[model samples]
Target: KPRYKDPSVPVEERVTDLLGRMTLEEKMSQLIQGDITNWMNETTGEFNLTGLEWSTKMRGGMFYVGYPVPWDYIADNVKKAQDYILQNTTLGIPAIVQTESLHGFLIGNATIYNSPIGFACSFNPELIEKMARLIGQEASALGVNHVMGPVVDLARELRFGRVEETYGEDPFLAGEIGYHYTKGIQSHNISANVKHFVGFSQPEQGLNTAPVHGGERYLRTTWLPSFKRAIMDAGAWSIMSAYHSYDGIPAVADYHTLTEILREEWGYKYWVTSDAGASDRVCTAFKLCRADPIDKEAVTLAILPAGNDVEMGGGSYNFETIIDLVNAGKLDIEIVNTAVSRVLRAKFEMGLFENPYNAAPASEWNKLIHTQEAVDLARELDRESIVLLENHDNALPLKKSGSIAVIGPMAHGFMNYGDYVVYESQYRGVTPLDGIKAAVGDKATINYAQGCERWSNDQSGFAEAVEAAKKSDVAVVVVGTWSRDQKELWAGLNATTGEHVDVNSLSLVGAQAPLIKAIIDTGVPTVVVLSSGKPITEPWLSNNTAALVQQFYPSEQGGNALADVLFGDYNPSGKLSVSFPHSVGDLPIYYDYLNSAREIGDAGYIYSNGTLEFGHQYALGNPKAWYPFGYGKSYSSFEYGAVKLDKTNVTEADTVTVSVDVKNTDATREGTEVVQVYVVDEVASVVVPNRLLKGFKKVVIPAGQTKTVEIPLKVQDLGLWNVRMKYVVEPGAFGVLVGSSSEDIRGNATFYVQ
Candidate 1:
């Protein structure tokens, strides 16, 4: 009955035995982090062939190569690395290969699905879950065990670089949506590493990991809850430490957060890994005490105390320094043992021990990886995610018979997939031009143009674009922000270097702006199709374009989906999850801000109200977004008769039914309408948003058909976070807004929760 080995022994017994057998140096290896910068450096780099000593000495996991390899190549490379680790390692431990798959499978040929911002517009948890599950199916097939995605942080202020990674501005919305994503990705036993742990969203300067000058209340109320839901409800297996500091303590080194809040308060039993190069923050803050001060060991002390188990790069994870610390008694051996146990536990849960190397059939891989089913799903989801902000004269769902021109730089390029899970190979993505060509055939003599390079000074291509627009009956100008156009959102040279932060501006980038302007100048009936990840401010385009469609990085089938909608194959029903602000100054813009809070000089004022503050500048409204959340238009029109409140006075214990009468008023096409029901809490114990989304349903009605759609509301509908910080159903007047979008409230009714 030995502790280490016995057929009848419990896992706990084996874990304890494993911890006991490891020496101090071996235990410390588990906690040391590998640096990514080492891999990026070709010369004198830590992970170079001669630097095998550095890699082997690291008891922590090895850093992955950042080179953009195709999907199949990534799979092959990972297997090769695993084989190398298996053959060489003394303990037969397998190295975990992590990569960024924020939006879609980072691997090539795989579909680049919609950004989280676009998914937020759908407000369909089930849809997001299904999409995530599909993402996992593809990723896991490639031996990817952990997906660092469904970034659950609330889009409190939009100026942040990773706005596309989160749900917009509401904790409840963020939490609920994040919960579904966690469940979907991890359901197949793939670990979901929900990231930027606590208070990472709100940086004082709207930059990544900047100091958060918010109070504990802000952390509790706005930040931590979304992640908590992901971890507790969805059972997320991993958490990434953010670079921001809360209450004067960096999230990476704050034991109160990593230990008490995440592990103790919420009972999270998972690996708490740090952001890439996060340990540098530790080294800079706490200088190691030494007889000779210049020979500092701050990196070792900072990482150990912060509970960082693995470094993401190569050089900064100093094992010799850690060994010295252990000998000097500056660090305890128990910390190292616990860290290793956690890492091993995570690896075991991922089934890496049982199947160290993935050996699925290549035939099976070919069949399931990017099959027709995946493409079809991508097409459908892309169509559903398109937000139709404006359709002034019923200009959408264009006639298939019309001879149209598809003009833009990104119209046919694979490079326009925006950010995250990008495919460099052209065969993988179905570009808008390709989709149009396939859909229309000879019926439409589709002309084209380069429009312009994606964010460049070259206006030479604008002539060709305009010529194509002039020659065609209708011009479809697909344009947006480029990688080089987005610099303000991300961090330094390397931070801005990746595909993630190439764009320098929020608006339409360099050549595309002038290119689009030229097309509009042609006087041809035009439709502006914007392909971007973050929200853009394009008042001129939104106002002047005959019809406008917004698709936020809708993956591989996005182009085909756009063609389907443009050619009347499918009616656009996709809604916006985030808002498109009027200007760059209004960077962190969102739809759910309170009216009082939106006032100038107010404590919570996001920024100045912009030109939209006065009236319907675009025949839309004052303080109007280019398009509001949950807004989309179809070729056909819808008419709402009136919203009927079944009960005026409702009790907390009772469930109430609220119904709305909606009619499809147009003649040609049948379409689906998303019935969004929002509640406005007039007064509350604590300050609440002007409106909170309570209930919604997606229903399809035939052309000229009328139906009564019922939305159910429970006590939760009337509840609010009270002065005591608990959710309560207070006695008050609730204004219910039932509409197509947040701005277009078709009908309104009042109710009281007694």
Candidate 2:
């Protein structure tokens, strides 16, 4: 048997043996990815000319094949594709099947969890890991070998449309969550693809593919940390490059970013692929190629030399272009060999060679797709993700016996599921209206009104909505952005938020604000529920509403989870993973900022003689967030004891232990609290954020019980990129702040590193 076909051979040897026998055409095939859905007729289960030809030759992988395809059909097709490659190709190579599993497997009947922003609010990496494991199990059951997910991009710009995909605004938080997500996915033998390598989150003017300008220091400090953690700590197997250019260099063609930073500096040993059509866009849209009127050949020339191993989706980098470039001496054969070897290595590592075909029976696939375990986990995650921003006079925990008015645009629909939910799973999930009705059953009289369309200015239904509100004991107004449907390309602005749906204004769109105002004015104690992917600047609601609940696009079980919180069946403990600015103009308003960037006098807000202050106010009386990061309210109260540090001094090699006592003071209810540990460099060679979240742990405390939580901090946690552009721990005194949220620091202590 050939060395490449021998299961006992080392993967490196197998990769080399395979590469040596492959012709240029075959090598190029390993570096390109195509969608199998494009070639297969969904109704007939027959392959078209494109599918037959590709199957005969084989390629790097096939993507987007499982949704709507019958489980038996998918398994049969996967087997057929693998058989064709092994029988016809000169060298039998198994293809890796890739699929999207951002929140859940983007396949029919798959379990849907809360969006990344929603789960990030839980501050529970273990939960995310568990969700990813289930998502992987579903994808693997469908014969998918790679999953594109766990978007680690730091959402620094609120206007960016893909905020829902990100973990949140903090690098440390994103890193911690991303690390666990990668671990969870790969634990099931599926390769985890951590994506949008760098600077893709904060696009200029909130437009997709917009230019980003930043020095290396900013990149290292903000954008690169999360990716680093995924690569170094989680052992992520694949990376997808961003579509945008950074500092005038296209990501596809930026050798400094793709090669020097990712490979050389970080010592990454994984393969890098272009985002769909990213290679072609580098030349046609970004115009990065030096060739006049740059074409596909130029794109191939520019991108392959910069370390992009694979050209995903439809692209200019194909067999002919690669062979032509090599023959013309424009691109080196060694580069082609390297790229091909990496692709082959990935397949080998995935054990695709030994068992390339799908073997799971139809019964197993049917039972495992969305199992009871998956649903229960999804419900639990969604329940934990509901954040209570305000509970004025404790207006929440509504009585089950009262007549309640559920009003607003998002009050009745499954729009809260976000953009990636598949059609079949959508029916299985409960809507806010359905969940509310189910929760109350015949115990309460429920009235629901579509107060206004998400983006419509018409207030024609306002009178009806007001009547419903007035008739009820209390009104629940579900407001916020409406994301695009699953079928949309998400290329245009959505009424609310989703991918490529950047917004110029973060306020409640269209008639939502007025609708909310009308309901509030009806003198019905109103609980404002924001079902949005991003923060909505609702100062009016913040000041006047009886209560405010921030819910990101919670997934299939969202309705039930939300109802659980509204009726006091579950305590609202989820924290804000990102800050909520008072206005869109105050955006990029994260909790962590350099000390020099913060306001010094009167903390940015000043009032005189009981009257309002004018120009002296920073960004109109305090540019602080309406609700700070990590801020959340519980049904019961929590009392924080003073912080205790095991040691006052330490060196770069030592660790400092931070301990705090949290007590659930309310004897009637048990709740959970996320104990956050933040660090402040008292003095440093370079400027640093006033506070940086170093570590956090979510603990459940029973009523009237005190729980002691301890977090260990290393010297590296106190380090920064100094004037020399080196990440090092400078000898200094560091301040430790223990708190429930960034702005709500309850205890402080000092430690020193010498």
Candidate 3:
């Protein structure tokens, strides 16, 4: 009755009969994960013997016990650590708990939503696959079964700081929103994990584990196509690696990026891990411990030949330095039984040996956590992630009968829940002054006023925020970045952004730009909002606000989706998933790069008098983006039309199509557009970009109605990587454009490839 104690075998023959009945200390304790508060006792919840002798010598799984406890004390501490590894181990195994479901379910009353750059500014991957299927049914009703997250990184360096945990700066829109957030979190059986992998989104100077210098054709055309489309089109069964260092190795020791580009050329057979303390930062931050200094088996002999199948928190590998480096042969017991048969075939396809306890009951997790269909899907992803970057004269739909005011420092706090929220009292949520005082109940007269302290330099509450904007009649203020409830060694100097807080100024911090220029110099009519995570340059509220929004970090129904897009009761069609540059020195300002003949014409110095110059620019501003990458705005008014093309000639196995039309022409105002498309290539072998998005949709209309849309592409979506890095599709011309944002293009077409 063996085949790993049957149960209808086959999960690779029960992970090859449980990796030949384990033991090299049970296959190095199935590659180490620990820390469930080192086996309970959080105030005598019981269990000890040093947490059952480290769960019978490493029963592999149980990271941060989904804090914010009590779901029957996290199902009685994961059924007393899988019943102490199925009764004092020998080969019983059953433990995969893990957590952090990024956008939400970072534990406690889950369902937080918005942040992955506000669900990639709602370019809508089926609303981030229904918010990763309600964060995988509230993390499998609290007992969790892995998760980690859909941080399919790609927000390319906005001073890093985890660019609100990525899914922005387009890599085919962070691989179609991480392939529908990894097919909606493994369609509820959990797992997911897709993360830091290749190049951890342009680190280097932006800090956090730094070093990436890109190469290998910028990791196979911009960070390995969103982790090779989240493990070849969303099957993604775990991968973490990336505490930096790409070119000089260390992405958990890089053997051509974790085994010849993720398991021999993109086949990626699951499990990888590493991140936290990255196996002792590959010997204290990529020094590979100076190649064997006082060899504690020199960093698990360079991360077990660089393939890394788990080592998460506090690194430098453990399991007693991997059974003393496989009894000193310097590692390799068939690579620890091939990383313990990929963690016992992901714990027998995660049924974890016939249900590893707590399948749900704490009265079914108190009737499934915050249900009401999880606060109406977190207020419909905080109303499709609010963007509206400027309204000017219309000054927002606000006007619920005068007297408003609100003020700054995220007006009435809880800083719009950005950073890894660990149960701020199960986020009772809503707070732009409680959704604009419950959207002006009893008609208007609100007047709140924090005005400072979000990384303060307190301009003495700008005289009670300009006397509540001189007795209010409009002035919503709200300003940005406070890096939500910071804490991670905070000795004061408050946070202005999270995760290792990297900043160097993106603007609107302390005294929120002079309390938003003294609430727009009390002449009132302000509006502002922002509530940022990134993108904050302000340019004086984009030149004296009359309106302007943005809002990333919109979770827990971000203040009733900012009072339902400031009163029109929703209609802001969010956009701009990264690229509001206009100085963070127009940073790595993306919208796809490449063709830069110095921003058009006269290419560089040649002005002896004949005129022809070009270089730098910053006489105090002008590097471009004060909103570009698919910017967003609409109180209703669309248009577009022109670009048609059904076949402009193609080859390399053809397919073109294109089309466009989009109308929503404002008549009475019902919007929601997001068309996009881009492309360009022009002539490549290696140099391309100046546009690339390659397709997007959204639509919605109804006001004047028009629609049409279309898209289609292929010929390997106009390939590249040439110069012998291979990938092709080069037989000439290809422009396209069609738009709603990347600098509001408005249709154009061209094609050829033969």
Candidate 4:
């Protein structure tokens, strides 16, 4: 039989013919899956054919070596797998290879850019699309067809473990980001699997793969939009099911989600793969095991009904068992053929069969891994992402000419390249201490000290750190959570010691917090840079420090970026994507939320009596977050002139245009000001948040230069949750405020929706 017939034939007919030719057992074999390379094994010896044959018999496709491996190694593995499989296969059918790409290819030392959270803050979809395009180029540069990434889950719940991997707590934002990412990655014709189908973010206890407890409304309004955007706008070719259930249906096996909602309603025409080892979860999560004469047939029947296609990893799933199911008339051959066709389609799109054995260029891999351009971008992004929370004496943009002491363990951490890069990579990234020394040079005398171990309980290193701080004119202390280690429960111990992820607590680990206090006691001018994923609870760090900078998991060049901001090389422009809570008790905090019944003084008299005497701080006004979203300071100051509105009133269909003038006051350095537009729907049929950010723009201005930024506002942007909970635009009085921060509105305008 010919491998590929004619290119001139209609694609649907070609695919249908291809599916028609495969046997029941052969088609079932195609649904099986496995990784080509195992990261857990230390020895790179001969391939495991015994296990491979067993998995192959189960119709498992091969999973390619994905993350943490260097690019050259990935390419080598692909060639090895392709050559081996081509020589040994009876049917000569090549297997599929899958890899992690939630934030680009997880390959070590590769250009580790921003994750979904930070990218959302950029508010630049084109830039995001370009990044994904680069990722596809790199992924294709190595021999691979599938890049599993662009997590489409909404950041609905702040405490979710993978919130850092998602866009902000807005469906629209997630949708926009997902659409661009899917489009970019798929440009190379590589399959981009927009993932976690539904309820992946609302897991119980914020654990990975935990069960979701949300109702249908949450799924319709919040969760499904990102996935819908990927399907409709980006034309994503693949989707992976979440480990959890939505309204009691396991996402992997639910026919309603996999077939009805996704395929029937939305018309998703693509392959749906299960998350790693999710098939086993169906039996375990739902407690489906039978105590009576254990009917294995019934169990298999139960698991297949839900939308699961392929089982990832080498396990009990085997083609022989599928054959048994087919012989018994328990499973249909057509279903098996459909899955195999989809897998083949994805592989063919990547041009895998054309040159199956091509390897990644070793020489090129060495050179391009951490190019100077990538490093420079990392520095720029770091500078942009850093939020200057407080500066008392204009203490920021520190004079590089002065003597400085870099204190704390994180100050010299070469591995703390923001949070997105592979921690165990052989590549060397710049650290804060190294950055400061390079920025200052001979003009400034620089000293360093280890303030404390990142996760240790010992306070023994404090004396040395304090001594260094006392000797300098100013002290720069670095603090934050460690890049998640495998042993860390928050990230969950995935492999062994270093592979874990997800940080549970929002507190600075180990003795770093106390060490900061000790250094601050020296009375020397001090600056603090927080290198963390999520925001931490450090009130004193905010109040006492001369200047405080928040740097999220930046990529490989984070250290250099930190250095640029410390001196006056770059101005900080990035704003917070999520709100910072004062304490962990304030978990799940956000900028947009309706006033609750408790907030409206509806709760009874004992509490009311207590409130009358002591006053209900919690019940009064908007809850206080440590720092609001869209808040950051720059090296130079900006002044906002009065806001100008084109119309005093707007109808339901009217488009409101507003303009504001932003001027840079200081002449020292150039910077960008983020013009934020917010709307307040005063009287409406539905309730709404006190304020909602509708539009924003990142604009650059030179010293003493003033530019007028005009923003177009759609009435739909002002829609609120109605009595029926549907988002609807209501006729009412509306107010627009323009500002740098949520609380610091510099100008305002009022209009009526009549």
Candidate 5:
């Protein structure tokens, strides 16, 4: 009878007692997070006990490597493995199972909310919190105690396909979104594993896993805020370090970011993990492994003490190889105990030790997902996440009794697509065609045509689409970038964007623009819907279209949501968290960047031919994007009052209270507006962004009525990294600009540091 085995014992004492009894082999194995797919036969759809015993007996837990299986089967398999470890192991420690819920429960059949970018566009963190809670409850029902999710990286690089995985390009917005997501997921006793730690986005030249730009101040200002908020504010329990190098050293071996900053400064007590075989990269990608035989020793040393506690168990860590190093005294035994202690403590805290048998029957598991509550959340998120970019002459709310042409590759199948989704799932996602057909019923004749392949230049079908548009009362043309291959497992050959799907271009792929132009030329008033992962940066698409919608893979209920907005059943309120630059040439495009970068801004020397040979800030077009951050349209018009401040000056101890009144001026429809407050540093020792988002509130105003919105900002939080690379609140005048979008500042006031 061990004290560790008793439920009445305190968790810290129990963890220490358990660690005191484990063999060196057990301790080393505890450091490895095994992959459960090793026991499965994917081709035959069989998940047997072929290698489950050794894997469970030796490893700490089973982590997901983007595997696709029946959700019920996975739960049962996890339960069986845990039972084996409890019954057969000398210590009887139950194993944990890790899964994914980046957008939804990754096993599918549950409600899939829009990807992170669209979810962030709502500018309402409460909705994302609700979404994460549902995702956590669904995962818990399946015996999933840990989930990798809510990627907090700022998507500043348009060339990176994984932009949809993040909360767009603003650090504050991403932080605010991530804080609630972390709180919600962890609420269900599931560990919310925040990923790619810091600066994983903004890779060099916008390529995936490439070297990232370096500057200590830049890192502190723009990249570290989200991860910091996730851990310090939201109590996130786990971290997955990035694949890219942080400075010159591989992120896997960088003690500064992994240990000094994360653990020492931020007080992150949970375990840190490698992002998909990252320990192996020390030997292959970065060539930092200095072992003579190129064995596992170098990788083990690289990760063991550098604050990376768990090896994703992706080859590089060999037990015998580690054992030899432990015996040789190269690796300290206390370090192994430290890592094992964290994992065991997390398990106990998650209630795994008290009751770990969680495999409910398939019928019972199904009851937890797609319930009325879950599906309703999916619909609401999809409805609010739709950003109306243009509605010239109120071309939306179209008549249901007329012939309509829905033309483009994105109009038909799986419009709710991005990386990290099971293409074939029990949940039937609503496509644009599916939703439109259901909404129109028998009242309208729908003519559908995919005029061009999403990623192809073939124009053979353009004439057919043109004829359909010409014959219809108005045309609904849906188009944008595709982030998946139709016939692949998990993700296959067709991933134009997302995860490993990085590209050099930011515009719509193939003949999508040409297809839109062709339909618009038919003299039919065309409403364009972009079912995309990132922004479509062409000006003509927004300017020439009758109306436009930026629906960033709002799948699950995407089609239905679109139909609701189009028919005036729901007004579009989602804003652009990410900006739409004129072209890739204008990047790295974002609403926030230091004032120095724009001092000589938009001044160009020449634009003779297709391009320019000389330029100042930009060669041709000004740095202003076609659409800026917080830009969105509604059927109803809204007006803003002048900004009012409680006091003109403030000390570090005082809080800057900002107040503004907003009215829904439209005579008919009610509207929601994201009242954003941006802070501009009038003078600083070290340069700072021209204006940074400090506070925002989403207010729902009744038609012709006014609602007062008050946002409080701490004077301490307005500080920037100084010349010595230390965060400080410099005594300077700061301007407060309250607006609907970054470009549409309607009110301005000044405050100063006393």
Candidate 6:
């Protein structure tokens, strides 16, 4: 009956037509969205019609609904809700479902790849794109239109509890991955968003949801890179604001970042969302408005008018207070139209107006979920994401036909991870013990023991473990922090890391390290396999073990991948995404630091109560990382040749072509190496990192074969935010360094910027 419903009209024309027909409350319904769990019964997989009517009929129409349609009825349940909304509402506005497709399709039982920090070790953005495409395909089949994912926050703070949820410690790497992830998931009209907006990871003292310092210069250089890439490079459909305040203003209410930079400067055409209850906090928690405290009208006046389009909690948090504000003349009507139109534009752009229902059969979508190809890809990701920190005298690639002892709580523990996912048991999984047993069935004798509980002083089972290790050819000890469990929702009450679950120490929980020490003392070669998303900071295990492998919460398929790497079935190729500090004494140990941050003038050596003779920084221990970022070892070895630059002298507007030859030194095993290309601004207006990573490539060469690797670097990447707050490349000499790791620079060539 209306031009908005005429399929021939353009999206913008239709949005304008419908927006004109809507009242104040009706426009708000188009802007608000929320969880559907209130209408669902997880136990029976049934829906409450009463609750659905109340939740969906938001002031007369339903705009969006968050997902998790239980049991295997996703398609049916989606259609059921759509039918109710379309046939019985004031306006037939379809619900735009935004699910948490972090590393997997969190709404349904789909392919689960390794968590953010895990696949980050792979150092392959192309693989990230491929994985996200599959996630988008699954999202399409499940009728999910939006995904709040690809958390592109650069995790510089290792002590931060949510480190497991981010790409580790590098802006270029995080931005590249963010670009690919948004490109991949948004493939099937499943609008993908990169989140926590800006500076969510860089908290004061490494605390989550706390005020961020570092001023505008640090925020622009370090924190905003990934989010910028997600928008400008990938055209992300929407973005969620952070929970913390930056430079005295909450992110949701800051007009400078949300309106000026994102919308005006970057020309972002899509919508913006509040990170659950974040908009409400501007008034409730931050106390920005003292007179009214404005609980209901705060997000309307402060957040919506600033730049935010919709609220995450929606009507669950506040009433339609914007109507009152508009009538009282406190808030402008144009601001309301602006936010509402963006919300409508998102729906129209996503084709929600034409095909509001998912008409596909349940069987068709079920086939797409966790397909065999996806499962194999997950295992491959698991293999490539497991970092080999140490391999002494070729201790790994254990003999298949020998006695083996697998000990530790994580050996048979609940290891499947993703901050939003239910425990490993909820989905398909292969624990470390499961894969070890499956790896050596008839050829090897397997002995297993729970060395100790995750967070307890119970050393009673240590005897069983030591006895097993004594007779075994290799003692495979699995240990690390427990950030997940089946019983608790998200970082259960006892969890050590995940979301708000911060840690006092980065060492192994309970006596897991001591248990490993006991097994290693048995004189048998021990391979320490870690099952953690967060880095464990005990330098003892790293220094003493025959081999140290870091498995950062490799989802379900981790066991199979671990066995493959340990037994030479697959070469271990994963690299460290973040730096591993010797201790927490070195709190911020990122490889990329300004030149003058270090203590100089011979006053740096103070490890033991200002003992200068002992050594650098920490008298007993040095200030350097035990294993630096971009570091990992394979069963095979690699050698890098001299760096060759295409044009030695180029302007700031030019591109630098860096070429190098990599050789697999080991004739016995083939390997894939991440050729890291870093830029050194030799002379600049302000100090910069000694060598900051700009570009890298992952190439595979056969045993004893050489391959030429070339990486392109834009001169623009070498620019830094000067004291005047402008990103510019000064006329100077710049050096290019080629390395296996940040600390392991093997080749260098000069590049001059004129």
Q: What's the candidate order when arranged by decreasing lDDT?
A: 2, 5, 6, 3, 4, 1
The digit string of per-residue lDDT tens for model 4 on 1-754 reads 5535545555566567666666766666666665554422324534565655655555445564654545555676566556666677654556556666665566755677645576566656666777777676666667766777778876655555566677666665677778988998888777788888887876666666667886665566557777988987688888888778877778877787777788778877668777766666666556655524444454456545455666665334533366678688877766566667776665555555554643457666655445565555545555666677788788887887767989987777555532334546414667787778888889998989987888686999888888988889888998876555211333443211111244456677778888998999999988998876566777667778899988766655667777877787777777777778765655566665554521343211223235533234443322366788778787778999989989887787888898999999978668888888878777766444667677777888998899899988878656754557566677777889898866678999998887
Per-residue error (Å), model 5, residue 145: 0.6
TM-score per prediction, in order, is 0.83, 0.95, 0.36, 0.85, 0.95, 0.94
lDDT of 3 by residue, 541-639 (tens): 665788888888777768888798889977889888888875576587787877862254221333336674555464334566668888888899888
Q: Write the per-residue lDDT of candidate 2 for residues 46-96, one digit (tens) a residue.
A: 867667566445454545464556666666666666777788667878777
Candidate number with greatest lDDT: 2
Error of 4 at 434 (Å): 0.9
The lDDT of each candidate is: 0.68, 0.82, 0.76, 0.68, 0.82, 0.79
Clashes of each: 23, 2, 2, 23, 1, 2
Lowest-scoring 10 consecutive residues by lDDT in candidate 6?
A: 599-608
Summing lDDT over every window of 10 consecutive residues in candidate 3, give the lowest-scoring window.
Answer: 597-606
How do the candidates rank by TM-score, highest first?
Answer: 2, 5, 6, 4, 1, 3
Inter-residue clash pairs, candidate 3: 279-316, 280-316
Q: What lDDT, from 0 to 1, does candidate 3 have?
A: 0.76
lDDT (tens digit, per residue) of candidate 1 on 170-220: 666677778888888887777788888888776666665667776654576
Report the error of model 5 at residue 657, Å: 2.6
At residue 738, give the lDDT of candidate 6: 91
Model 5 regions more than 4 Å off: 6-8, 43-50, 290-293, 318-320, 425-427, 485-492, 599-616
Q: Indicate whether candidate 4 or candidate 5 has the larger lDDT.
A: 5
**What does the lDDT come to for candidate 6?**
0.79
Candidate 4 TM-score over all chains jointly: 0.85
